[PDB]
Amino acid sequence: VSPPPPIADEPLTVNTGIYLIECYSLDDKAETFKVNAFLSLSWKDRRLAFDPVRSGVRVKTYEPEAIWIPEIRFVNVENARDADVVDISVSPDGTVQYLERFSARVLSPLDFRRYPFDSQTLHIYLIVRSVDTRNIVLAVDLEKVGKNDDVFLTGWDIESFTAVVKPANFALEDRLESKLDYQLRISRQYFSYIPNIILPMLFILFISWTAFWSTSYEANVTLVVSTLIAQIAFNILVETNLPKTPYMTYTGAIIFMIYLFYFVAVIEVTVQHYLKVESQPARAASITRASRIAFPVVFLLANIILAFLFF
Amino acid sequence: VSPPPPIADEPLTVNTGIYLIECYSLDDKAETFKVNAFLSLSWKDRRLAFDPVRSGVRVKTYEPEAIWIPEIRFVNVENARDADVVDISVSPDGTVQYLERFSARVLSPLDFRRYPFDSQTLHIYLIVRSVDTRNIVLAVDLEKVGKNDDVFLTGWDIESFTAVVKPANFALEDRLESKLDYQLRISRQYFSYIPNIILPMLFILFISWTAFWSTSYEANVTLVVSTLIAQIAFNILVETNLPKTPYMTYTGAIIFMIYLFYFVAVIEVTVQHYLKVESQPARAASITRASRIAFPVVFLLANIILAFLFF
Amino acid sequence: VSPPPPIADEPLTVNTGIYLIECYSLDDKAETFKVNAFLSLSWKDRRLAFDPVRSGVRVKTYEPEAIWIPEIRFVNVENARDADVVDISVSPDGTVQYLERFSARVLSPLDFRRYPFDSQTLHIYLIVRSVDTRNIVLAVDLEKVGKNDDVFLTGWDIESFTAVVKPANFALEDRLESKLDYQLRISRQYFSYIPNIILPMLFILFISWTAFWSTSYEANVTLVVSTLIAQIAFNILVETNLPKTPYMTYTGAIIFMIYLFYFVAVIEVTVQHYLKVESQPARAASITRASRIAFPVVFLLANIILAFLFF
Amino acid sequence: VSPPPPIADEPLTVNTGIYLIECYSLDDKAETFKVNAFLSLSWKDRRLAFDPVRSGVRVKTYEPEAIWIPEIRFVNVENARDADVVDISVSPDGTVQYLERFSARVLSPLDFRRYPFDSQTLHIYLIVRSVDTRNIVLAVDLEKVGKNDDVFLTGWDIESFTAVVKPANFALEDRLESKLDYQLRISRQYFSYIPNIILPMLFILFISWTAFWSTSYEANVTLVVSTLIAQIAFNILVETNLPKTPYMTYTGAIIFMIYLFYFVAVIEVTVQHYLKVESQPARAASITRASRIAFPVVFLLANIILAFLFF
Amino acid sequence: VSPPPPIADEPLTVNTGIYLIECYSLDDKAETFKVNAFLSLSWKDRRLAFDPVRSGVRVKTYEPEAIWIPEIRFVNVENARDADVVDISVSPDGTVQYLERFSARVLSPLDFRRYPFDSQTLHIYLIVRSVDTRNIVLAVDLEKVGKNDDVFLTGWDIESFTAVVKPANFALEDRLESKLDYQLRISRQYFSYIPNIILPMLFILFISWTAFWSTSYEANVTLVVSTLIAQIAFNILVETNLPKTPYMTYTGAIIFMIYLFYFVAVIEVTVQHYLKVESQPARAASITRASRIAFPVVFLLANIILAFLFF
């Protein structure tokens, strides 16, 4: 089978539509997501025209192998989609209505700068390559673009699923390509981060600050070094769920800042002890008393500055 | 092959049934489970009718390709099910009895609010899309819905496997869809959580409380900070088996509460030491003596309040 | 093709045999194992009979598609087996001899009560379904049941591979089903558990007991709390290799018992220190001297009691 | 179908091209990467020649099965590529233009000597085996070698994608084999390693150095041994993302050097305490004061020496 | 198609050869490895003979379906191999030359007794089952056995790839089977184990030994118990890469021995402190001074004894 012949010199228009049934497995580290959807296609093939009076039926059903079907592929997939043709229906004028249900692992890059208070635009790029006989162009049938109400992406809020109606038509290896951008806007459910990571980090940080009400070096060393070990466990825990970015993320900046605070508290603890040994407890007492206010105040201001830069 | 033609303008009823052979791999983090079952379908095709006295046979066997079979799919599957047709049998009136065995990975959301004392209703949604010729509707043959006695879901108790007999009939992309809800009611086997997680957590908490019978700051700091590190290990261990929820879970609340108790015990330990250094051991002794009763009493009351709110 | 017709009203006997080539991946947490074996089938089809004299051949070879073959399935598989037909041979009387080589992931539940000094009976359930035309029944050809001498299941000893010769005949979805039970008896290689888990746990427990020869609270607190952290690491290590059971396991009981012993040693350490501070070292010295004998004696007796209850 | 017959005794030239659509999953431990690309092939088949005047067409389209296509494979793949033929086009002189889209998991060894500041040359080896009738040889059509602008390999910078235009011809089992080398030059995005691993390691090392301003053996032991435990966590964290190399890596050298520094600081801490006990604090004070300068100076010089040897 | 008929009563000889293209994923815990190779087969089929003068051709090419091909399988594979026929060529006398490229996951047991200074012999077992018409026997064409120069197994040195030329001919389920053993000799690149595991273990052990130059029980307890925790981290790290063996490994013996040394050092530390409290520092001083020599000497001798027993 060859493609439909043109009436004039016009390109063949393939109307497309994606209807999302399921969204699952948004892997942050891998920058992938899995999708289960309907792919709807429509184009005119005059060669397929029929008289319903003679044929006995008002719509004709076909098997994919029986007729010409445009080779539509996804740009940003790991492997080619797993597809099952649901229906192929030809109307008397030769208007073909193709419908398949597919599943695919989509590659879509993420912006982690504001993580975990971040939002993403996931893309599904539909493409068609023009044949040597006639040029093929993609179009969006908005009445056939949507998502199921139930569609839940664990840990995310689905804002919208829309398509950029104008295809990107460009040459690639001496032939025309027609590319459509289907965009799924999502925002992270930051809730869990607060009681599970943020608040535990603060509690252990405040525990380390009790060293500012102690003159016992051995106890102070235990407090600061032990809380530092607990903090490292949280840093590893957090970083394992993120990919290695060539930029600073909000979480990353906070983690880095906390290390500085632990480092400076060791300096304070060390300085205070050195003075007490040098028989200067009056000078050490001045530093500690200052540390009691300075550490929370600088912690609060540094965080305001960070939140300002990132948001 | 085309669908059976109607006698009048009635829709074509497909009687369904799912008989569970196996249930395995209930992944809490992924909110998925695997199933191995029988799918039974039944509908009337008058074109397939015959006379038993003339044919000599009471039942006719067919190959799937030989006759029309309705395209039945699962809504909440990762990939389309792996299926093997077991038998196709036609009765003299043209009643078709189809049976396949399939395996599938089902996406079903879980409510972790009461975890590990939660119960769940897992769903298997059966769907059929109507054809241009006639509308297809789903039905439940209760005599063909069930599960094998051996069916064991590791760490769960299977309460019941039933179907909501009334299908959800709705339009989707200008065609009728008929959806059936199969519900598998399960309850978590909480036994293991008690000796493996709950009791260890209490033991380490009680060890931290021995600091209320000590005047040794260095020792107290060691007790509270070391037990805190052991608690963190349990918290990480527990939370790794759960997904990130946009709500508080029972376990989450408990873990948060324990952090507060560790934080308050550091305050007590710090306050007591500050007073002893300020040459006020009488005041410190009053606080410690109070702490010995206050901490267990507030721990017990806070837990009663929590259990009340969640159950 | 239809099934062989009966001479009288007798059922169709399918003689079966499984010959194990490989056993691998016994996943305890998943309660699964992989198997690579030969499945041998044999039945009489009178339609396939011939005279060896006029044919010139003593045997005829066929392609699966050419003749009727019984649809034999495994009950307890994840997905349907991956099979390759090795040979199909017909004798003059029409006795068919079928042979395939298959690989499959088998679901078989395990009893962890005596872990890691446990033994298991793994099952492979063979099943055939009857047809309207006739009743199909399974049988065991003992001369065709076995295993390769090389068959090694990593961490297990293979005791025996036998079949329960009488099939279980029952109705399922208004048709008779013939089920055969192939049982593989295995016993765990407990060797490694002794130097890698059991002995390390004892060594760290004995290190905690050196606190009974010390009056130094700070040192005692360090000993008991640090060894407790090492034990927790071993507990996590062990429990990660086991599924969550609704019953107590031997290992679980031991782990629980060790927690009690650590808890009681903290009480002793705390009590002893409280008395020394209260200017009662004579009373503390009596308790500590008693603890030196009491702890090992109660540890040994509790273990004898546990081993008695489980074995 | 047989291969095109030679005009004289010349080998058959197959012009190749690879156009990268996607690059993902560069696994360092596994030394693999996944690729989604276009494979373009071109060769002359005189048997397929035609007159454009008589036929009325300027280009003929064929199905893969209809004509002879060279068996082109990849040398360094896990499994054979997943390929879908996009188009086959013949020009009047019989010049065939084949295009497929494939996905493949490529095995390419990496040099970890300068990690995490390393660069790699990933290879895709294309191969063809000569047939009994004629010798096949590969060529590069540079106009058909490229990559999509969007092509992003998470954590890497893509420098260039080129092909070594002269094939590596050789005999394998008495047949000519023409092999092409497609090279993808990449360089690691080392940014994240600085705040996430390098700077934390320095901070904990500097914390251990505060022991040079303390006379308290107990506190010194705590400082050095606790920071050592934090460093081992980072060492394990780092080494888990790398395979076991038969050579020293930059990172591994640094990790080893840090262990020596921790070891030497324990010697200092031990020596200082031994002298204070031997009533020689003046001698100990000399060593500590020296250590305060010696440790940072030797640390800085050793690092310059290391960076010099590796870069 | 049926097998070639014999001239007399001789068995049909199938000459085999395996040429390794790639070796990857040697999983120690799973005792598996992946292979990508050429499988070459050769046998005589007199029915396929022709005259090279009359036919004008020296060689005839065939499609697998066109002629009889022996069913050759691998014994020790997970699933049946993924194969692609490269070429089938017949010479005038009817000598068939078959070549396929395959990929497979091979199950081959490993001896961990000398780990990580161990060597292995990996096996690939080729098998053929005799047909009822005649017996099939395997042979090795040494000119077609080999490996690619590039073949790299990460962390291993490939010593040799040879075949045991005499097949093992035996009866299995009332038919003859011919089995060939292809052996791949490999040795572990033990380099990395020295700086990454062995030397860190020694450094932390030597740190624990500084307790023999200290009279401070609290500090000693901290040194020995903290270094013990670091050792446990390395033990877990090591043993996670190994399967559970029914024998002692070199590594396992060393790890066990180190536990004893830590246990004995706790006894020393405890004894020394007990004496100092009992006002016997002179006796304690004698024990530590002895320990300073005894511990390194016994450590060195025990290791020589161990290395002797294992190598």
Ligand SMILES: CC(C)c1cccc(C(C)C)c1O
């Ligand atoms: C998640 C699970 C292992 C767990 C953690 C913490 C507390 C509890 C109960 C008390 C809710 C619990 O069972």
Ligand SMILES: CC(C)c1cccc(C(C)C)c1O
């Ligand atoms: C998991 C396994 C290695 C284990 C842990 C703890 C105790 C035992 C026996 C003695 C029950 C044991 O073998």
Ligand SMILES: CC(C)c1cccc(C(C)C)c1O
């Ligand atoms: C691999 C990586 C995370 C890393 C670890 C340790 C040291 C270095 C530098 C100093 C070379 C490093 O970048």
Ligand SMILES: CC(C)c1cccc(C(C)C)c1O
């Ligand atoms: C796991 C392996 C690399 C290893 C660990 C511990 C000890 C050794 C030697 C000394 C036997 C060792 O080779």
Ligand SMILES: [Cl-]
């Ligand atoms: Cl696709």
Ligand SMILES: [Cl-]
């Ligand atoms: Cl489905």
Ligand SMILES: [Cl-]
């Ligand atoms: Cl099966």
Ligand SMILES: [Cl-]
């Ligand atoms: Cl390939």
Ligand SMILES: [Cl-]
């Ligand atoms: Cl050559």
Ligand SMILES: [Cl-]
């Ligand atoms: Cl050649």
Ligand SMILES: [Cl-]
């Ligand atoms: Cl195979």
Ligand code: NA
């Ligand atoms: Na088509």
Ligand code: NA
């Ligand atoms: Na301490």
Ligand code: NA
């Ligand atoms: Na059909």
Ligand code: NA
């Ligand atoms: Na059949």
Ligand code: NA
């Ligand atoms: Na072809």
